[PDB]
Design a protein around this motif. Structure first.
Motif, PDB file in Angstrom:
ATOM      1  N   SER A 220      29.386  15.894  50.331  1.00 35.06           N
ATOM      2  CA  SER A 220      29.323  16.228  48.923  1.00 35.06           C
ATOM      3  C   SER A 220      30.298  17.367  48.664  1.00 35.06           C
ATOM      4  CB  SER A 220      27.902  16.657  48.552  1.00 35.06           C
ATOM      5  OG  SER A 220      27.809  16.986  47.178  1.00 35.06           O
ATOM      6  N   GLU A 221      30.771  17.472  47.427  1.00 31.13           N
ATOM      7  CA  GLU A 221      31.604  18.592  47.032  1.00 31.13           C
ATOM      8  C   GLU A 221      30.707  19.773  46.676  1.00 31.13           C
ATOM      9  OE1 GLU A 221      30.741  16.085  43.415  1.00 31.13           O
ATOM     10  OE2 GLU A 221      31.399  15.724  45.473  1.00 31.13           O
ATOM     11  N   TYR A 222      29.415  19.604  46.939  1.00 33.26           N
ATOM     12  CA  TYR A 222      28.397  20.607  46.636  1.00 33.26           C
ATOM     13  C   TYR A 222      28.775  22.012  47.085  1.00 33.26           C
ATOM     14  CZ  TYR A 222      23.879  23.054  46.872  1.00 33.26           C
ATOM     15  OH  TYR A 222      22.858  23.973  46.752  1.00 33.26           O
ATOM     16  N   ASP A 223      28.689  22.948  46.148  1.00 29.91           N
ATOM     17  CA  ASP A 223      28.897  24.357  46.423  1.00 29.91           C
ATOM     18  C   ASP A 223      27.519  24.999  46.563  1.00 29.91           C
ATOM     19  OD1 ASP A 223      30.350  27.118  44.469  1.00 29.91           O
ATOM     20  OD2 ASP A 223      29.222  27.071  46.356  1.00 29.91           O
ATOM     21  N   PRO A 224      27.132  25.341  47.801  1.00 27.71           N
ATOM     22  CA  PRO A 224      25.763  25.756  48.091  1.00 27.71           C
ATOM     23  C   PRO A 224      25.410  27.158  47.602  1.00 27.71           C
ATOM     24  CG  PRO A 224      27.113  26.050  50.031  1.00 27.71           C
ATOM     25  CD  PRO A 224      27.978  25.348  49.009  1.00 27.71           C
ATOM     26  N   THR A 225      26.389  27.896  47.082  1.00 25.96           N
ATOM     27  CA  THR A 225      26.137  29.260  46.608  1.00 25.96           C
ATOM     28  C   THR A 225      25.631  29.298  45.168  1.00 25.96           C
ATOM     29  OG1 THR A 225      28.440  29.644  45.888  1.00 25.96           O
ATOM     30  CG2 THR A 225      27.868  30.275  48.157  1.00 25.96           C
ATOM     31  N   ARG A 226      25.708  28.162  44.480  1.00 28.49           N
ATOM     32  CA  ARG A 226      25.301  28.084  43.079  1.00 28.49           C
ATOM     33  C   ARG A 226      24.057  27.221  42.896  1.00 28.49           C
ATOM     34  NH1 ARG A 226      30.657  27.306  39.200  1.00 28.49           N
ATOM     35  NH2 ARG A 226      31.404  29.477  39.275  1.00 28.49           N
ATOM     36  N   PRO A 227      23.152  27.642  41.996  1.00 26.66           N
ATOM     37  CA  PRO A 227      21.945  26.876  41.678  1.00 26.66           C
ATOM     38  C   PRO A 227      22.278  25.535  41.024  1.00 26.66           C
ATOM     39  CG  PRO A 227      21.806  29.151  40.851  1.00 26.66           C
ATOM     40  CD  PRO A 227      23.232  28.899  41.227  1.00 26.66           C
TER      41      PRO A 227
ATOM     42  N   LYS B 278      21.973   9.079  27.766  1.00 22.41           N
ATOM     43  CA  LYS B 278      21.747  10.455  27.315  1.00 22.41           C
ATOM     44  C   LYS B 278      22.967  11.344  27.545  1.00 22.41           C
ATOM     45  CE  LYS B 278      17.675   9.915  28.608  1.00 22.41           C
ATOM     46  NZ  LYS B 278      16.646   8.840  28.692  1.00 22.41           N
ATOM     47  N   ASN B 279      23.956  10.814  28.259  1.00 23.67           N
ATOM     48  CA  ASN B 279      25.202  11.527  28.536  1.00 23.67           C
ATOM     49  C   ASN B 279      24.992  12.821  29.326  1.00 23.67           C
ATOM     50  OD1 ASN B 279      28.256  12.137  26.567  1.00 23.67           O
ATOM     51  ND2 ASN B 279      27.916  11.418  28.666  1.00 23.67           N
ATOM     52  N   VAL B 280      23.935  12.847  30.134  1.00 26.92           N
ATOM     53  CA  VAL B 280      23.668  13.970  31.026  1.00 26.92           C
ATOM     54  C   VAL B 280      24.861  14.202  31.952  1.00 26.92           C
ATOM     55  CG1 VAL B 280      22.120  14.920  32.771  1.00 26.92           C
ATOM     56  CG2 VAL B 280      21.205  13.458  30.961  1.00 26.92           C
ATOM     57  N   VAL B 281      25.517  13.114  32.345  1.00 27.20           N
ATOM     58  CA  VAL B 281      26.697  13.192  33.204  1.00 27.20           C
ATOM     59  C   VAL B 281      27.609  11.974  33.039  1.00 27.20           C
ATOM     60  CG1 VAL B 281      26.934  12.379  35.610  1.00 27.20           C
ATOM     61  CG2 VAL B 281      26.654  14.846  35.121  1.00 27.20           C
ATOM     62  N   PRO B 282      28.924  12.172  33.237  1.00 23.13           N
ATOM     63  CA  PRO B 282      29.892  11.084  33.146  1.00 23.13           C
ATOM     64  C   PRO B 282      29.902  10.265  34.431  1.00 23.13           C
ATOM     65  CG  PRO B 282      31.011  13.073  33.803  1.00 23.13           C
ATOM     66  CD  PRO B 282      29.572  13.458  33.562  1.00 23.13           C
ATOM     67  N   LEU B 283      30.155   8.969  34.317  1.00 18.64           N
ATOM     68  CA  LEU B 283      30.228   8.112  35.490  1.00 18.64           C
ATOM     69  C   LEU B 283      31.635   7.542  35.635  1.00 18.64           C
ATOM     70  CD1 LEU B 283      26.799   6.226  35.105  1.00 18.64           C
ATOM     71  CD2 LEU B 283      27.274   8.406  36.217  1.00 18.64           C
ATOM     72  N   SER B 284      32.046   7.262  36.872  1.00 16.12           N
ATOM     73  CA  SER B 284      33.358   6.676  37.129  1.00 16.12           C
ATOM     74  C   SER B 284      33.424   5.266  36.556  1.00 16.12           C
ATOM     75  CB  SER B 284      33.646   6.635  38.629  1.00 16.12           C
ATOM     76  OG  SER B 284      32.793   5.713  39.291  1.00 16.12           O
ATOM     77  N   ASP B 285      34.630   4.797  36.249  1.00 13.65           N
ATOM     78  CA  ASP B 285      34.789   3.445  35.720  1.00 13.65           C
ATOM     79  C   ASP B 285      34.141   2.422  36.650  1.00 13.65           C
ATOM     80  OD1 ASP B 285      38.087   3.971  34.222  1.00 13.65           O
ATOM     81  OD2 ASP B 285      36.068   4.266  33.413  1.00 13.65           O
ATOM     82  N   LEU B 286      34.337   2.590  37.954  1.00 16.24           N
ATOM     83  CA  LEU B 286      33.712   1.704  38.939  1.00 16.24           C
ATOM     84  C   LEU B 286      32.195   1.723  38.825  1.00 16.24           C
ATOM     85  CD1 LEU B 286      33.912  -0.251  41.321  1.00 16.24           C
ATOM     86  CD2 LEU B 286      34.023   1.742  42.855  1.00 16.24           C
ATOM     87  N   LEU B 287      31.613   2.914  38.870  1.00 13.96           N
ATOM     88  CA  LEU B 287      30.166   3.050  38.798  1.00 13.96           C
ATOM     89  C   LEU B 287      29.613   2.435  37.513  1.00 13.96           C
ATOM     90  CD1 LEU B 287      27.852   3.955  40.426  1.00 13.96           C
ATOM     91  CD2 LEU B 287      28.200   6.303  39.634  1.00 13.96           C
TER      92      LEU B 287
ATOM     93  N   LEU C 104      26.815  15.504  41.146  1.00 15.08           N
ATOM     94  CA  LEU C 104      26.994  15.434  42.601  1.00 15.08           C
ATOM     95  C   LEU C 104      26.578  14.079  43.175  1.00 15.08           C
ATOM     96  CD1 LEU C 104      25.729  19.000  43.550  1.00 15.08           C
ATOM     97  CD2 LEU C 104      28.084  18.167  43.762  1.00 15.08           C
ATOM     98  N   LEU C 105      25.455  13.562  42.691  1.00 13.01           N
ATOM     99  CA  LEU C 105      24.884  12.309  43.186  1.00 13.01           C
ATOM    100  C   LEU C 105      25.766  11.117  42.833  1.00 13.01           C
ATOM    101  CD1 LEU C 105      22.495  13.569  44.412  1.00 13.01           C
ATOM    102  CD2 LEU C 105      21.061  12.795  42.491  1.00 13.01           C
ATOM    103  N   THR C 106      26.298  11.118  41.612  1.00 14.68           N
ATOM    104  CA  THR C 106      27.118   9.995  41.137  1.00 14.68           C
ATOM    105  C   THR C 106      28.546  10.054  41.668  1.00 14.68           C
ATOM    106  OG1 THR C 106      27.544  11.131  39.025  1.00 14.68           O
ATOM    107  CG2 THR C 106      25.764   9.478  39.060  1.00 14.68           C
ATOM    108  N   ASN C 107      29.044  11.265  41.911  1.00 17.28           N
ATOM    109  CA  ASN C 107      30.358  11.447  42.520  1.00 17.28           C
ATOM    110  C   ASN C 107      30.329  10.880  43.937  1.00 17.28           C
ATOM    111  OD1 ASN C 107      33.046  13.555  42.359  1.00 17.28           O
ATOM    112  ND2 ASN C 107      32.286  12.980  44.395  1.00 17.28           N
ATOM    113  N   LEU C 108      29.274  11.215  44.667  1.00 21.16           N
ATOM    114  CA  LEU C 108      29.045  10.691  46.012  1.00 21.16           C
ATOM    115  C   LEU C 108      28.928   9.163  46.016  1.00 21.16           C
ATOM    116  CD1 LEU C 108      28.400  11.253  49.070  1.00 21.16           C
ATOM    117  CD2 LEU C 108      25.988  11.403  48.368  1.00 21.16           C
ATOM    118  N   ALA C 109      28.093   8.627  45.129  1.00 24.33           N
ATOM    119  CA  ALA C 109      27.875   7.187  45.052  1.00 24.33           C
ATOM    120  C   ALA C 109      29.172   6.450  44.780  1.00 24.33           C
ATOM    121  CB  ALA C 109      26.845   6.854  43.968  1.00 24.33           C
TER     122      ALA C 109
END
Ligand SMILES: CC1=CC[C@]2(CO)CO[C@H](c3ccc(O)cc3)[C@H]1C2
Ligand SMILES: CC1=CC[C@]2(CO)CO[C@H](c3ccc(O)cc3)[C@H]1C2
Lengths: 244, 9, 236, 9
Positions: free
Chosen positions: C25-32, C219-228, C41-46
């Motif tokens: 993941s591109e997850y930055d563990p220092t931030r909440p 709800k547009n909580v997050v954007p998804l890739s064209d593929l996804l 993070l979940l959809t970027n990974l998927a």
């Protein structure tokens, strides 16, 4: 418990004897269909079938050994899968049609009467066609239906605090017994050892498709209720609530 | 709960 | 063909060889976390996993025999089941946690970071728990994931016949592994049934996750890739 | 369709 001491032949006999009847629809055949009236017939029928299903469930060896709470959970989870596998079984001899009732035999073009329903009809018909391709037997059908009852909600028995998977050894023992029964049935029918495991897998993979159809059907039914297309019985409303 | 009752009855 | 000529040992070898990498993941563990950040993070990974899944699929014995249309159909049907069984497998040795990536290991409670996601987490964790109960083996896992790819969309298609022959070969392979492991005939049949019945739960989870993902999209909580978005739009 | 392209490549 007795269910564990049943022979394979005894298991089959018990299941066959527990089978619910095939109910009729209230369809007045001299009257037309509308989206509302077709949904009404289908849900009226399902409501009546549900009562028979609950009483069938009690006759499935091992089911009464479970707590009332667990019995409720299993039926809440699997009710539409069970109605649907029954429908597909009834419809085996009617290619291109679904025998909801003997007086309600619908082809996929009649499914278009209800918005969104033809998609569900197509999946049901594809399953009916698979049943024919496999030459599914009645003894196998009843085994699969009991497997759905016991399996579908067994992975959603979660502990109250922590929500960790509860061990349900008894349910799994009975499931193992039904596996034993299916193999016995296939051996009795002259299938080779290899054919036995191959067919066992073919039959169980059906259940993945049945789950899929249940989920899609539940969403469709929920859409119909949310658009006030048909009034659902209190029982059906509650079975729907358990899931949307 | 209807299911609960039908299972008991 | 070629799949039908494989021995059981060769099928296991092929499937193990085809396995996709475990991504980070591109997850930055220092931030909440926020609802938006976690879903991102979940959809970027998927999305990144999906590209690798397509390469894996092409290496599943039998898959490349199918027409491009049929290949597309199968992947469209099964993509989330496949991501999910992969997830469950990765998390098997981490009770109560979901190992989305080695650097993104989430507790059950972190599912509550996103509206309606904890219910999906609970189902995934229960599956991982079941895998643990059964002592699911890597060789069994790869068979199961391949069965999902070939089976989930097969009813809704000589194409079907060939796929069912390949499915039969994978069943043979699973049994082969159980025989090798020293299981009796009765134990082999029971275990095969136990494993395949899990696929019903995986289908259920995919359908639920698909609905949830679609709600987060609406709800547009997050954007998804064209593929996804296209893989998701395939289900409705 | 992206999946189509990815499968071709
Ligand atoms: C319970 C059902 C009601 C209507 C739907 C569409 O919403 C189509 O009929 C289905 C059905 C399946 C098996 C039955 O025994 C009765 C109805 C499903 C879904
Ligand atoms: C693909 C997914 C995206 C977000 C959801 C909730 O919408 C939770 O994450 C899930 C998931 C499963 C397997 C993966 O490899 C990545 C994410 C599912 C569903």
């Amino acid at each position: 418990s007795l269910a564990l001491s049943l022979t394979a032949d005894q298991m089959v006999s018990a299941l066959l004897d527990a089978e619910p009847p095939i109910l009729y629809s209230e369809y007045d055949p001299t009257r037309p269909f509308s989206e509302a009236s077709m949904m009404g017939l289908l849900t009226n029928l399902a409501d009546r079938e549900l009562v028979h299903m609950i009483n069938w469930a009690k006759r499935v060896p091992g089911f009464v050994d479970l707590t009332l709470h667990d019995q409720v959970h299993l039926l809440e989870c699997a009710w539409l899968e069970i109605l649907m596998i029954g429908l597909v079984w009834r419809s085996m001899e009617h290619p291109g049609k679904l025998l909801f009732a003997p007086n309600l035999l619908l082809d996929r073009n009649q499914g278009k009467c209800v918005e969104g329903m033809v998609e569900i009809f197509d999946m049901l018909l594809a399953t009916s066609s698979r049943f024919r391709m496999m030459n599914l037997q009645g003894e196998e059908f009843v085994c699969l239906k009991s497997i759905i009852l016991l399996n579908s909600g067994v992975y959603t028995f979660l502990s109250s605090t922590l929500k960790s998977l509860e061990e349900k050894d008894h349910i799994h023992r009975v499931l193992d017994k039904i596996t034993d029964t299916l193999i016995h049935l296939m051996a009795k029918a002259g299938l080779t050892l290899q054919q036995q495991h191959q067919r066992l897998a073919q039959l169980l993979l059906i259940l993945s498709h049945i789950r899929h159809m249940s989920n899609k059907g539940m969403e469709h039914l929920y859409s119909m209720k949310c658009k006030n297309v048909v009034p659902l019985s209190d029982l059906l409303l509650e079975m729907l609530d358990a899931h949307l | 709960k209807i299911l609960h009752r039908l299972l008991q009855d």
